[PDB]
Amino acid sequence: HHHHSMDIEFMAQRAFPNPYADYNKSLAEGYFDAAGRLTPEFSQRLTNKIRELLQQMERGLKSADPRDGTGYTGWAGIAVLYLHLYDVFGDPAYLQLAHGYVKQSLNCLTKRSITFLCGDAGPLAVAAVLYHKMNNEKQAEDCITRLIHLNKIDPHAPNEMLYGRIGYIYALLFVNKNFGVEKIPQSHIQQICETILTSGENLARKRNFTAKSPLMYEWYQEYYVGAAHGLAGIYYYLMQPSLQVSQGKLHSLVKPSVDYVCQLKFPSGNYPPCIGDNRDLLVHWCHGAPGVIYMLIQAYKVFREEKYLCDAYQCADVIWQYGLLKKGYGLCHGSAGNAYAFLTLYNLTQDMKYLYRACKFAEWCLEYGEHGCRTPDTPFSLFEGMAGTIYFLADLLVPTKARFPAFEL
Ligand SMILES: [Zn+2]
Q: How far is the CA of 284 from the centre of ligand 1 (A)?
A: 6
Residue ranges for the known binding site are 286, 327, 332-333, 374-377
Q: How far is the CA of 304 from the centre of ligand 1 (A)?
A: 30
Q: How far is the CA of 336 from the centre of ligand 1 (A)?
A: 12
- Residue 249 neighbours by CB under 8 Å, 6+ apart: 197
Q: How far is the CA of 287 from the centre of ligand 1 (A)?
A: 7
Q: How far is the CA of 372 from the centre of ligand 1 (A)?
A: 19
Residue ranges for the known binding site for Zn(2+) are 286, 332-333
Q: How far is the CA of 209 from the centre of ligand 1 (A)?
A: 27
Quote the CA–CA distance of 290 and 22 in Å, as a whole number.
Answer: 19
> Cα dihedral sign for 143, 385, 226, 88?
negative
Contact 335, 275 (CB under 8 A): no
Count other Cβ atoms within 10 Å, centred on residue 253. 22
Environment class of 38 (CB within 10 Å of its CB; exposed 0-12, middle 13-18, buried 19+): buried
Q: How far is the CA of 172 from the centre of ligand 1 (A)?
A: 23
Q: How far is the CA of 331 from the centre of ligand 1 (A)?
A: 8
Please count the residues of the chain: 409
Q: What is the resolution of this structure in A?
A: 2.6
Looking at residue 10, its amino acid is F
User: CATH number for the domain including 261?
Assistant: 1.50.10.10
What DSSP assignment string belongs to 94-144? Answer: HHHHHHHHHHHHHTT--S----TTTSTHHHHHHHHHHHHHTT-HHHHHHHH
Q: How far is the CA of 5 from the centre of ligand 1 (A)?
A: 17
* C-alpha distance from residue 8 to each of 177, 209, 337, 371, 372 (Å): 41, 30, 21, 20, 19
Give the CA angle between residues 60, 65, 67 to the nearest 5°: 145
Residue ranges for the known binding site for glutathione are 327, 374-377
Q: How many domains does the chain have?
A: 1
Q: Which residues are 38's β-sheet partners?
A: 32
Q: How far is the CA of 186 from the centre of ligand 1 (A)?
A: 31
What DSSP assignment string belongs to 199-248? Answer: HHHHHHHHTTTTTT-S----BTTB-B-STTTSHHHHHHHHT-GGG---HH
Q: How far is the CA of 332 from the centre of ligand 1 (A)?
A: 4
Write out the residue range of the structural domain in which residue 254 sits.
1-409
